[PDB]
Amino acid sequence: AASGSALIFDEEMSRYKLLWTDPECEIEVPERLTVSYEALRTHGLAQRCKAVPVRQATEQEILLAHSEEYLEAVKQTPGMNVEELMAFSKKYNAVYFHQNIYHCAKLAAGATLQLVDSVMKREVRNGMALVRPPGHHSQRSAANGFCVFNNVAFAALYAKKNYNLNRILIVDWDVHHGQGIQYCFEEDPSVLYFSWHRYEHQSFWPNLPESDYSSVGKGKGSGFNINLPWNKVGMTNSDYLAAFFHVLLPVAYEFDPELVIVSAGFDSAIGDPEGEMCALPEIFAHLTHLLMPLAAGKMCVVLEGGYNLTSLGQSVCQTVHSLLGDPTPRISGLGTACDSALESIQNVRNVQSSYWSSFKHLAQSETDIVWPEPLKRMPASVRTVVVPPPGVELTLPKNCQHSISESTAKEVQRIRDKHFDLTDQNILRSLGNIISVLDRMMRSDEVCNGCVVVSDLSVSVQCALQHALTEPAERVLVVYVGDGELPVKTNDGKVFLVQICTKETEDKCVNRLTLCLREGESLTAGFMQALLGLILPVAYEFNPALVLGIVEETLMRVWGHMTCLIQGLARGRMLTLLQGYDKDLLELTVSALSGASISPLGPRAPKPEDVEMMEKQRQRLQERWGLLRCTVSESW
Ligand SMILES: CN(CCCCC(=O)NO)CC(=O)Nc1ccccc1
Ligand SMILES: [K+]
Numbered sequence: 001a002a003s004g005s006a007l008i009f010d011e012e013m014s015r016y017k018l019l020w021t022d023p024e025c026e027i028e029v030p031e032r033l034t035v036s037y038e039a040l041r042t043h044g045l046a047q048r049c050k051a052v053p054v055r056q057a058t059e060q061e062i063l064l065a066h067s068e069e070y071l072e073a074v075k076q077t078p079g080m081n082v083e084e085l086m087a088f089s090k091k092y093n094a095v096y097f098h099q100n101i102y103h104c105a106k107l108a109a110g111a112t113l114q115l116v117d118s119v120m121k122r123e124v125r126n127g128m129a130l131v132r133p134p135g136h137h138s139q140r141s142a143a144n145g146f147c148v149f150n151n152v153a154f155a156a157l158y159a160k161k162n163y164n165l166n167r168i169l170i171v172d173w174d175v176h177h178g179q180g181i182q183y184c185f186e187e188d189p190s191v192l193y194f195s196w197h198r199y200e201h202q203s204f205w206p207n208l209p210e211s212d213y214s215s216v217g218k219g220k221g222s223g224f225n226i227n228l229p230w231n232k233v234g235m236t237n238s239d240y241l242a243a244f245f246h247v248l249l250p251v252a253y254e255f256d257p258e259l260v261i262v263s264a265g266f267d268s269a270i271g272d273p274e275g276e277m278c279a280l281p282e283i284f285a286h287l288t289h290l291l292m293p294l295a296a297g298k299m300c301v302v303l304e305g306g307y308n309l310t311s312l313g314q315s316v317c318q319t320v321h322s323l324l325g326d327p328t329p330r331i332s333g334l335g336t337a338c339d340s341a342l343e344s345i346q347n348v349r350n351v352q353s354s355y356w357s358s359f360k361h362l363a364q365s366e367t368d369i370v371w372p373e374p375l376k377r378m379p380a381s382v383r384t385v386v387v388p389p390p391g392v393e394l395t396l397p398k399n400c401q402h403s404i405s406e407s408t409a410k411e412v413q414r415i416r417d418k419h420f421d422l423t424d425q426n427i428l429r430s431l432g433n434i435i436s437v438l439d440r441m442m443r444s445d446e447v448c449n450g451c452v453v454v455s456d457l458s459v460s461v462q463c464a465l466q467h468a469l470t471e472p473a474e475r476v477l478v479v480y481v482g483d484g485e486l487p488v489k490t491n492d493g494k495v496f497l498v499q500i501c502t503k504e505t506e507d508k509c510v511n512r513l514t515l516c517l518r519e520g521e522s523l524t525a526g527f528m529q530a531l532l533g534l535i536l537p538v539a540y541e542f543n544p545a546l547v548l549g550i551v552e553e554t555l556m557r558v559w560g561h562m563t564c565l566i567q568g569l570a571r572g573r574m575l576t577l578l579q580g581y582d583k584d585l586l587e588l589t590v591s592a593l594s595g596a597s598i599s600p601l602g603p604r605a606p607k608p609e610d611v612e613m614m615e616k617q618r619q620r621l622q623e624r625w626g627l628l629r630c631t632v633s634e635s636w
């Protein structure tokens with residue numbers, strides 16, 4: 001399977017710039033590229049990427065998305081002097097031309113196609129192209145908003161033609177609406193376009209009625225265009241994550257794309273003079289991470305906008321970190337989206353309810369700026385430690401490793417004499433393994449997570465949790481697949497328990513989420529719905545310092561997706577206890593913990609009984625855990 005991350009960049013794309021006075025355009029500078037690449041080099045990230053050369057897009061490739069008339073007109077601009085270039089730029093809205101911009105536009109487009117080929121040929125797992133000019137505003141026959149050719153539309157049209165793909169997801173998290181992309185795939189159900197964007201009730205550029213939530217696509221493409229307008233500035237991490245948990249991800253995982261292309265504009269980050277949003281650069285680590293389980297990780301990130309040279313460098317690094325599989329930074333202070341965002345979210349969910357399973361239950365009655373600089377992100381020496389039963393020798397990925405010191409063994413004796421009387425010398429071993437793994441996970445950046453196979457749940461769970469709480473881990477999220485009660489107390493604020501069980505048990509307080517899922521062929525859709533719409537919002541707001549997974553011995557081809565997505569919490573520090581040996585479940589768990597590619601789910605819809613149970617959970621929990629909200633609260 002594929003390894004590595006491509007970084008596609010060329011200094012030539014910084015060799016065009018604005019040549020006359022224009023306050024509309026003067027923010028789009030060559031230094032955006034140089035500052036972004038230099039930030040990647042300073043933090044050692046560029047050196048870990050496969051450098052893939054830029055190339056020119058050919059004429060035939062440009063004609064995939066643009067008209068011969070527009071290409072011919074642009075092809076004349078290298079021969080133009082300044083007067084002529086200004087007169088040519090004035091034919092379009094918010095865009096400037098330069099003797100070298102046609103050359104650079106073919107390089108920006110060619111670089112994107114290079115990234116698509118490297119990913120689709122399995123030469124790398126994923127990658128990023130740092131390109132100028134940006135593309136998502138350009139149209140069949142027009143330059144627009146600093147864009148000459150539509151780099152990302154190219155990429156999806158090219159991937160359709162040369163790899164025969166049927167489903168491509170485009171995620172445009174730039175702060176501006178990519179109307180060029182929307183127009184290009186308006187009638188095409190093979191390409192799902194999602195865009196969030198500053199809108200302010202159509203008063204923000206480009207001021208288009210069709211940038212509103214009601215544009216769902218046309219014809220056979222209805223439902224495959226999703227616009228989420230931001231009608232106030234100052235949107236926060238909570239707003240962005242609410243958008244992902246309650247709009248984008250439910251749709252994306254049901255769509256099941258074969259390739260993901262990101263229109264990655266970082267003018268949606270704090271400090272940007274165009275976006276005026278308040279999301280931290282660290283949010284882009286999670287926006288990347290939450291999409292990586294799609295399409296077996298095949299993700300092409302393509303630079304669009306981003307104008308504060310400082311938030312720009314930091315957000316680029318946070319994205320590349322996540323592409324390389326580095327641990328995600330903890331996001332603190334999360335809660336409800338603001339009222340304006342919740343209104344946008346609820347409106348798009350309602351209009352989209354005719355088209356998407358996750359929303360379908362809504363249709364019927366049944367129903368000078370400063371911020372803290374980001375902390376260093378370090379890949380662990382060994383990422384995953386594994387402790388299979390005694391004498392079970394398995395083949396581990398190159399970043400995994402097998403499992404007891406004198407200190408540790410003394411601790412198990414101390415613990416045994418006080419609380420357990422237990423003498424099963426192999427349980428005593430597993431308790432020594434839990435403590436040894438937890439110590440490596442929490443003490444240093446040497447190990448990031450681990451899996452231990454165990455026999456007795458009660459003593460194992462109690463030692464794992466109680467030893468984590470005194471590391472100290474101020475907060476521990478427990479995720480338990482099985483029935484019965486655990487030795488886990490959620491009375492203080494230090495533990496949240498997610499339990500996936502078979503018998504409907506009354507959940508009584510708000511530090512527990514109990515999911516009784518009706519057994520059947522519907523189970524995979526229901527679990528994914530619960531994961532994106534309930535489990536992830538609560539976990540992210542809780543912000544644990546450790547995740548503890550627990551599976552009792554008494555099917556779940558969802559485990560790999562959960563293990564991957566749940567590593568967005570606690571800097572990826574997850575300990576999984578598997579009760580009993582299962583070769584396949586242990587291989588799957590270790591593979592996902594180690595950062596390997598997740599195999600797609602393919603195909604659908606879940607039981608109304610399960611949707612009703614999940615929404616009852618949301619109603620029961622969203623007053624305490626506001627990130628669960630996907631409607632505006634009713635005021636007294
Ligand atoms: C920035 N332009 C076009 C946006 C495309 C950039 C992007 O990132 N697209 O993805 C709008 C504008 O009119 N700005 C403006 C005008 C006068 C004084 C100050 C600012
Ligand atoms: K956008």
Ligand SMILES: [K+]
Binds near residue numbers: 185190192225
């Ligand atoms: K579409």
Ligand code: NA
Binds near residue numbers: 089090092093094095
């Ligand atoms: Na103009």
Ligand SMILES: [Zn+2]
Binds near residue numbers: 174265267304305
């Ligand atoms: Zn933008």
